[PDB]
Amino acid sequence: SQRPVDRNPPRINLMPTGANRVAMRNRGNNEADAALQALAQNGINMEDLRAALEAYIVWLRPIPLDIANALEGVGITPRFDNPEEAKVDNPLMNLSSALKRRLDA
Numbered sequence: 001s002q003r004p005v006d007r008n009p010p011r012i013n014l015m016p017t018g019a020n021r022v023a024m025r026n027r028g029n030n031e032a033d034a035a036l037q038a039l040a041q042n043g044i045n046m047e048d049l050r051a052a053l054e055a056y057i058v059w060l061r062p063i064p065l066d067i068a069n070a071l072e073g074v075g076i077t078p079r080f081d082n083p084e085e086a087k088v089d090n091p092l093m094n095l096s097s098a099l100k101r102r103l104d105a
Contacts, residue, residue, distance in 0.1 A: 026075060031091060032098035035074040044070045050099040053092040056080060071095075 016022055024034035039049050044067055053071070055061035060083060063071065068078040076095060080086040087093060 028094055029098055031075065032094035033102075035071070035076050035091070035095055036099045036102075038074040039067075039070050042070055042073065046099060046103070050096060053078065054096045054100075057087055057090065057093055057096055 024030070026034065036046065036049065040046060049067050049070065052061075052063040052067040053076075056063050056078070060080065062068075063078040071078045071092075076091040078092065080090075
């Protein structure tokens with residue numbers, strides 16, 4: 001007997017201690033990654049949410065109410081308090097970076 005298909009799976013390592021919030025976290029890449037994946041399961045497509053926020057970071061184009069409220073749900077603010085600060089310090093700039101790099105890498 002044999003198996004023609006096999007796959008030969010990678011033996012995964014151990015996960016960190018704690019519960020829920022320790023795995024996803026909320027700071028920089030942590031808040032960004034947790035946010036976008038939460039948007040995807042809420043139904044907001046990766047391309048749409050990123051297009052909205054990135055256009056607000058670059059062109060200063062307001063985020064549509066659907067994506068905007070979805071961001072407020074995942075803890076991100078779809079506003080520009082001060083455009084100079086909100087291009088660098090903004091949770092949206094972490095969302096644009098994390099979402100682009102999970103596609104770009």
